[PDB]
Amino acid sequence: MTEHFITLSTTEPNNNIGIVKLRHADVNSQAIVAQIVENGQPKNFEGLQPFFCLMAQEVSEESVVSFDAKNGTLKYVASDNALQFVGRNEAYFSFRKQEGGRWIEQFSTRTFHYIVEK
């Protein structure tokens, strides 16, 4: 399949990132490879689980399968939900830990945009 590499910040805006262009009815897998950054340097998210939070336009949460918490990297495979809106999509990554039998966000990235083409 295809991969899309971008660097996402928790402190700074994510409007300057590389343009991610996904395909709506793709036969093969499509993934967003993200470098988590805090003040322009990698963010350790050891003991935390990343979540793909797609925003509803005028919300969809999915657990990210592959990640290197130490190097601050993650690989999210675009779901059918993430590819549904043909056009400009807005999403963010939330890092959570389990306590009380439910996930609790310790911190998150700032919103970024990706384009689903057809």
**109-113 long-range Cβ contacts below 8 angstroms, 24+ apart:** 109/8, 109/9, 109/10, 109/14, 109/34, 109/36, 110/8, 110/9, 110/10, 110/11, 110/12, 110/13, 110/14, 111/14, 111/55, 112/6, 112/8, 112/14, 112/15, 112/17, 113/14, 113/15, 113/88, 113/89
Domains and CATH numbers, the chain: 1-118 (2.60.40.3350)
* Cross-strand pairs, 41: 38
- The span from the CA of 62 to the CA of 75, in Å, is 12
* Resolution, angstroms, 1 dp: 2.3
For 83, the enclosing helix (H) or strand (E) is helix 80-84
Q: Is the dihedral of CA 82, 109, 50, 71 positive or negative?
A: positive
Sequence letter at residue 99 = E
Q: According to the entry, how was the structure determined?
A: X-ray
| Residue 116 contacts residue 83 (beta carbons within 8 Å) | yes
- The span from the CA of 34 to the CA of 25, in Å, is 23
Angle in degrees, CA 73, 74, 76, rounded to 5: 160
Question: Which residues have C-beta within 8 Å of that of residue 52, sequence separation ≥ 6?
Answer: 61, 62, 63, 64, 76, 79, 82, 91, 93
Q: Hunting for tokens 């993200």 — which residue is that?
A: 34
- The span from the CA of 104 to the CA of 94, in Å, is 9
